[PDB]
Amino acid sequence: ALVVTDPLTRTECSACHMAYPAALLPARSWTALMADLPNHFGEDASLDEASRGQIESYLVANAADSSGAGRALRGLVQTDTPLRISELPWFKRKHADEVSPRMLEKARSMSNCAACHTGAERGLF
Ligand code: HEC
Numbered sequence: 001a002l003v004v005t006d007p008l009t010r011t012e013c014s015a016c017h018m019a020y021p022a023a024l025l026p027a028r029s030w031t032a033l034m035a036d037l038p039n040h041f042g043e044d045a046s047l048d049e050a051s052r053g054q055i056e057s058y059l060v061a062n063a064a065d066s067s068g069a070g071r072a073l074r075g076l077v078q079t080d081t082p083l084r085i086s087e088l089p090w091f092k093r094k095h096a097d098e099v100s101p102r103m104l105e106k107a108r109s110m111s112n113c114a115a116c117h118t119g120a121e122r123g124l125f
């Protein structure tokens, strides 16, 4: 399932986009994100340390490499620490010949999964 099940992560990490599922980035990528929320893609996404710590635990514990080779890892080398799901080789492979300039214009960003996937919040893509 490609769904955030953790309530605090669901709340805090849906404030500005969809709460992205842990399974889509390796643990190192989640750590790096969670270590710099004051400088988060142009926004201040900083949290109180207690909330920050718990969210980091959940993301790392259910990351793409938390149960061996999740699909999202395909085409990654161990020295890659991607900070965007939308920059993964696996993501670009699934989207390349599928998204037209018009579909992309309407979504406004490949970060906006629900603009194209009605079931994105229930894990259906
Ligand atoms: C607003 C104050 C935000 C909060 C709270 C969180 N995030 Fe965020 N995030 C924000 C912006 C403006 C962007 C750029 C979107 C774009 O169109 O380029 C992002 C992006 C991400 C990503 C990358 C998405 C992708 O393209 O692959 C990830 C993985 C991500 N954000 C994670 C994340 C988490 C774990 C959060 C909770 C702690 C969280 N975000 C909150 C703005 C904001």
Ligand code: HEC
Pocket: 024, 085, 086, 094, 095, 098, 099, 103, 104, 107, 109, 110, 111, 112, 113, 114, 115, 116, 117, 125
């Ligand atoms: C429109 C501009 C899109 C945005 C934004 C995102 N996705 Fe997407 N995605 C889009 C299309 C047209 C398709 C192909 C559908 C098909 O059946 O060919 C996809 C595909 C996926 C998939 C693969 C689904 C499967 O066949 O198993 C996944 C896992 C997926 N998309 C995830 C995903 C996420 C996490 C996004 C936000 C970060 C996202 N997509 C954005 C169109 C669009």
